[PDB]
């Protein structure tokens, strides 16, 4: 039922994600990692051999695995997601999680850097660029997306519905019940429209802005998968997590 959809999705978002925008802004207002020296100091405390870029790569992909698991439980709480055939549930998650990951990642980013290690570290934007290629080519487009996404000044209530709409996308390749998933998205999107009307009355054009952000994220992920394959084939020590290689396979 759509009368409680917005609250239900927001509650599921607060329930399932270890980090959100309210929690992140409080912290951002944390050990600062800005060079090889502070990276090693941070790793001495927050990590239980390999090249510095491969170590960050592993900490990054381990974070994504955790976010994928949180997103999986979040989707389970979206009304109607569990009723879909299990193969449709896998497809929606497969193509949706990284659009959602980079959307939510904006919440822990500012112009100078981003929070890492469950809010305990803050790595600078310049240090990531100072790394060697191709590892220094990864985070730049995400910071750029996050900068324009953060300018919309969404809160966690807006973001929860946005992520739900990302997951329940009837456009994904290989979906079985397209017509029903499309109806699920229509309801989520309609609830999002109504919520943006009440929560952001100063911007009566915020909803088309968010529609474009969904398209921008699909392009950001497709280009990102290209880098995942560059690393999988040409970086020996940069082993891929089984869950992530499952997600990126044939996508």
């Amino acid at each position: 039922d759509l009368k409680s959809l917005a609250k239900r999705i927001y509650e599921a978002y607060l329930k399932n994600f270890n980090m959100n925008k309210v929690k992140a802004r409080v912290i951002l207002s944390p050990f600062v990692i800005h060079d090889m020296e502070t990276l090693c100091m941070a790793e001495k405390t927050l990590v239980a051999n390999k090249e510095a870029e491969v170590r960050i790569f592993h900490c990054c992909q381990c974070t994504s695995v955790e976010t994928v698991t949180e997103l999986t439980e979040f989707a389970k709480a979206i009304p109607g997601f569990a009723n879909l055939d299990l193969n449709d549930q896998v497809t929606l998650l497969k193509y949706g999680v990284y659009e959602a990951i980079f959307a939510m990642l904006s919440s822990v980013m500012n112009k100078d850097g981003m929070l890492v290690a469950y809010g305990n570290g803050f790595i600078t934007r310049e240090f990531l660029k100072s790394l060697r290629k191709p590892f220094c080519d990864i985070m730049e487009p995400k910071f750029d997306f996050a900068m324009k996404f953060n300018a919309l000044e969404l809160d966690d209530s807006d973001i929860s519905l946005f992520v739900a709409a990302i997951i329940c996308c009837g456009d994904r390749p290989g979906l079985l019940n397209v017509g029903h998933i499309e109806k699920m998205q229509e309801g989520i999107v309609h609830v999002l429209r109504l919520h943006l009307q009440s929560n952001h009355p100063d911007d009566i054009f915020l909803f088309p802005k968010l529609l474009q952000k969904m398209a921008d994220l699909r392009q950001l992920v497709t280009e990102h998968a290209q880098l995942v394959q560059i690393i999988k084939k040409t970086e020996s020590d940069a082993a891929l997590h089984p869950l992530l290689q499952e997600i990126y396979r044939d996508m």
Binding site: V68, T69, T72, E73, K76, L86, Q89, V90, L93, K94, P242, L243, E246, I247
Partner: peptide, 9 residues
Amino acid sequence: SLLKKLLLA
């Protein structure tokens, strides 16, 4: 698949 394993929790 692991994604199936996550969804059958």
